[PDB]
Amino acid sequence: SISDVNNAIRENNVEIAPGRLGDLPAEKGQLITIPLSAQGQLSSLEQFKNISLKSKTNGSVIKLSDVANVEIGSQAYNFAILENGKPATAAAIQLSPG
Amino acid sequence: ANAVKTAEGVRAKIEELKLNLPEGMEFSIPYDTAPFVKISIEKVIHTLL
Amino acid sequence: VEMAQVDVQNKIKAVEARLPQVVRQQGLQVEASSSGFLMLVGINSPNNQ
Amino acid sequence: GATAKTINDSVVTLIERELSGVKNLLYYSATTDTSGTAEITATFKPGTDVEMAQVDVQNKIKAVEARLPQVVRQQGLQVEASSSGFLMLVGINSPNNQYSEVDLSDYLVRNVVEELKRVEGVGKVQSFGAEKAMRIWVDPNKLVSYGL
Amino acid sequence: VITGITFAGMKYWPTAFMPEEDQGWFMTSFQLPSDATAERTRNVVNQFENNLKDNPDVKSNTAILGWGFSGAGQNVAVAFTTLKDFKERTSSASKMTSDVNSSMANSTEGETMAVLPPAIDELGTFSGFSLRLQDRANLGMPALLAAQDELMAMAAKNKKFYMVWNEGLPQGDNISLKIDREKLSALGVKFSDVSDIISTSMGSMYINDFPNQGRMQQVIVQVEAKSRMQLKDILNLKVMGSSGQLVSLSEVVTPQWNKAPQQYNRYNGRPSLSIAGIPNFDTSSGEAMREMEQLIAKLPKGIGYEWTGISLQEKQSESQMAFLLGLSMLVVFLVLAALYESWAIPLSVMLVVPLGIFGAIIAIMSRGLMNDVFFKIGLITIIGLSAKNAILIV
Amino acid sequence: SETQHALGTGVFGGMISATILAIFFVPVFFIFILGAVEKLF
Numbered sequence: 001s002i003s004d005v006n007n008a009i010r011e012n013n014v015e016i017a018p019g020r021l022g023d024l025p026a027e028k029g030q031l032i033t034i035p036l037s038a039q040g041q042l043s044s045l046e047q048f049k050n051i052s053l054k055s056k057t058n059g060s061v062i063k064l065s066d067v068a069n070v071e072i073g074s075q076a077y078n079f080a081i082l083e084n085g086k087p088a089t090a091a092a093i094q095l096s097p098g
Numbered sequence: 099a100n101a102v103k104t105a106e107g108v109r110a111k112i113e114e115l116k117l118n119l120p121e122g123m124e125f126s127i128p129y130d131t132a133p134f135v136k137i138s139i140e141k142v143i144h145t146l147l
Numbered sequence: 148v149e150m151a152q153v154d155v156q157n158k159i160k161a162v163e164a165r166l167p168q169v170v171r172q173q174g175l176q177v178e179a180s181s182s183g184f185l186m187l188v189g190i191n192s193p194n195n196q
Numbered sequence: 197g198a199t200a201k202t203i204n205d206s207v208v209t210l211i212e213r214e215l216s217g218v219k220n221l222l223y224y225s226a227t228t229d230t231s232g233t234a235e236i237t238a239t240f241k242p243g244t245d246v247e248m249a250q251v252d253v254q255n256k257i258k259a260v261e262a263r264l265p266q267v268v269r270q271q272g273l274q275v276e277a278s279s280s281g282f283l284m285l286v287g288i289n290s291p292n293n294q295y296s297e298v299d300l301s302d303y304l305v306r307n308v309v310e311e312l313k314r315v316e317g318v319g320k321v322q323s324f325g326a327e328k329a330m331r332i333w334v335d336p337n338k339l340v341s342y343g344l
Numbered sequence: 345v346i347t348g349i350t351f352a353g354m355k356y357w358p359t360a361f362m363p364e365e366d367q368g369w370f371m372t373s374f375q376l377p378s379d380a381t382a383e384r385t386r387n388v389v390n391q392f393e394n395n396l397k398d399n400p401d402v403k404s405n406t407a408i409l410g411w412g413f414s415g416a417g418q419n420v421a422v423a424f425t426t427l428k429d430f431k432e433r434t435s436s437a438s439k440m441t442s443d444v445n446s447s448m449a450n451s452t453e454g455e456t457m458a459v460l461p462p463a464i465d466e467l468g469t470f471s472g473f474s475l476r477l478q479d480r481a482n483l484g485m486p487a488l489l490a491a492q493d494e495l496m497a498m499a500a501k502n503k504k505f506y507m508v509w510n511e512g513l514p515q516g517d518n519i520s521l522k523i524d525r526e527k528l529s530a531l532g533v534k535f536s537d538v539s540d541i542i543s544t545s546m547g548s549m550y551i552n553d554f555p556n557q558g559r560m561q562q563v564i565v566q567v568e569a570k571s572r573m574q575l576k577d578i579l580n581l582k583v584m585g586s587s588g589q590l591v592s593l594s595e596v597v598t599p600q601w602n603k604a605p606q607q608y609n610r611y612n613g614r615p616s617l618s619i620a621g622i623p624n625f626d627t628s629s630g631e632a633m634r635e636m637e638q639l640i641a642k643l644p645k646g647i648g649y650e651w652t653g654i655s656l657q658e659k660q661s662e663s664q665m666a667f668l669l670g671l672s673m674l675v676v677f678l679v680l681a682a683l684y685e686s687w688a689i690p691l692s693v694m695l696v697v698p699l700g701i702f703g704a705i706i707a708i709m710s711r712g713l714m715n716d717v718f719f720k721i722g723l724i725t726i727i728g729l730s731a732k733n734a735i736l737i738v
Numbered sequence: 739s740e741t742q743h744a745l746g747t748g749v750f751g752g753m754i755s756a757t758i759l760a761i762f763f764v765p766v767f768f769i770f771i772l773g774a775v776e777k778l779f
Binding site: 197200201204208212213216222223224225226227228229230231279280281282285287306324327328329330331332333334335336337340343 | 406466564567568604606611650
């Protein structure tokens with residue numbers, strides 16, 4: 001179900017929280033403290049395409065691309081602009097009253 | 099605001115709270131700039147005289 | 148204009164809680180704008196790159 | 197619990213953009229550190245009324261409140277007027293060492309801090325101690341041993 | 345000739361804003377490298393306490409470990425040293441700060457900077473010139489850090505500057521863990537387990553409240569200290585796999601080290617760095633500011649600067665002097681002309697003023713003081729009194 | 739003493755300068771200022 005796809009997307013791209021080694025309270029004799037971070041997010045099209053789902057019917061492992069097509073599109077497709085019969089983009093400027 | 103009046107009020111509040119303080123606990127005001135606000139004025143007034 | 152805008156913001160502040168959770172998460176935007184368009188600024192690709 | 201860069205990219209710029217336009221603003225600055233908190237200061241021309249400046253800053257921040265991340269919005273933005281230096285320091289110490297530092301800090305926070313803030317002319321009281329709390333220090337090896 | 349001499353003396357004599365005064369206290373700031381822990385800062389603060397214990401002048405010395413006026417962390421400390429009454433005291437605060445700086449510059453492992461109370465209560469926390477060096481052309485943080493390093497070296501070479509330093513948190517190293525998701529899938533370990541185990545290893549988690557003697561207090565769960573001091577403990581964390589055999593994090597994580605700025609400062613919408621200095625003895629604040637801007641002129645392109653706090657007020661005071669003098673002269677001219685309904689009398693009264701300016705400038709050159717705001721007030725007063733003598737006669 | 743010196747020495751010197759040297763100069767200005775106005779008219 002689509003809920004499974006949404007769940008898998010949420011788990012694979014998790015945004016792990018940072019931390020600090022040596023943070024207070026610290027064990028006696030601790031001289032070095034250093035931040036530590038981990039990258040739990042996906043930053044490529046193929047990484048999202050390779051997200052793993054578990055089949056209910058058989059238990060086999062499939063990838064997100066198997067039951068979906070992943071692309072880089074637009075957030076919304078609401079509006080379009082035609083400048084002289086040609087594709088383009090535009091924005092409008094409204095002056096403050098007065 | 100006025101440093102002298104605020105410092106006086108804070109000191110009065112601390113004095114009030116000393117009574118309810120548990121034994122073995124002690125209040126202190128290690129650093130305060132209000133006391134220096136007065137002596138300087140005196141000097142100037144003294145100079146005026 | 149500014150006084151009217153701040154009055155509108157203050158008046159709507161009261162109603163913020165009553166709206167659904169989704170709208171509150173999205174927020175309410177208050178602005179002062181003209182009825183139309185001072186200008187249109189666009190970007191084009193002459194070579195279709 | 198986020199690195200300074202995260203807050204700088206997410207929060208500070210958006211706040212300063214709107215904050216830049218307040219009346220009688222000599223300048224403004226922003227600081228972000230590893231503590232997870234970001235402080236944006238606005239310094240106004242001498243002789244300006246503090247109360248008017250604070251309400252103007254509050255208006256401008258509420259103008260830009262919507263766009264900030266959700267978690268920081270839940271935590272909330274704190275706007276305050278204060279001096280740049282300490283008027284005085286009020287301390288509690290145990291001459292006989294009967295009470296430890298945590299007990300002293302708890303007593304300071306529970307009782308004395310609020311009373312001192314009650315006093316007129318006390319713009320802000322910054323406490324260098326934390327109130328008592330229950331702490332559970334978990335051993336990960338024992339946790340994994342039982343499969344928890 | 346006297347008018348020309350007065351003009352030259354007013355033009356070329358050094359300038360300042362306020363005179364230094366002794367308030368019976370001074371402030372010390374300790375800044376240690378990014379890797380310094382709380383114990384290392386505590387050791388230097390204890391060294392400072394030991395060095396000031398024997399000194400009779402000090403009466404009280406409170407140290408705040410973990411907080412500073414510029415940045416907070418385990419490598420920052422601030423102390424407020426209070427001195428005995430002036431009569432009993434047998435030393436000035438300036439000499440105390442100089443001795444502290446000289447003594448603590450070698451023994452300790454961090455930079456200690458002892459400073460006098462600010463000339464004005466709320467115009468800063470130090471007594472010197474404060475600068476903001478900013479990136480006006482998107483050069484980047486590393487470029488700004490290179491520029492600040494070059495500026496520090498240049499200022500150190502200069503004699504007009506006693507100590508020029510940078511106020512903030514130093515650049516520091518960081519560790520990033522890269523997760524082998526393919527090996528996690530191969531071993532059957534589910535990514536959310538690794539994410540959860542990493543997230544909760546080094547953070548305090550607030551759960552719920554609990555009554556303590558009638559007050560609500562927080563329940564906080566955190567990992568034990570011994571298991572969160574070194575990266576080996578983090579990599580030692582284990583997660584169950586598909587085959588029922590635990591896998592340690594080290595198997596499926598690779599650590600990588602980088603160097604980044606820990607603290608980000610911004611001024612007037614531009615990435616910025618806060619710098620501070622104190623003019624050397626026999627040098628004025630105006631001379632120090634002029635030398636600083638001349639040095640900044642030599643810095644790479646795209647790097648700008650702006651004065652803040654007391655320095656900006658000094659700049660405004662020294663810009664406005666001529667206009668105020670001209671307007672005062674015009675006011676007295678018009679008042680005298682209206683009172684006595686003639687042009688010769690007011691002009692004759694005006695001409696004397698340079699004579700008083702001559703005396704004022706020669707006196708402040710003879711005693712060596714500077715062109716501060718009090719000197720400006722005195723000049724404007726001598727204007728009126730010289731006009732008073734010229735009127736009394738004419 | 740720093741603030742008092744800064745406020746005092748300049749006025750002190752400028753006062754002697756305005757007194758000793760003006761008593762001889764302002765009369766000299768009055769002289770030939772009326773001469774200049776005569777020359778103009």
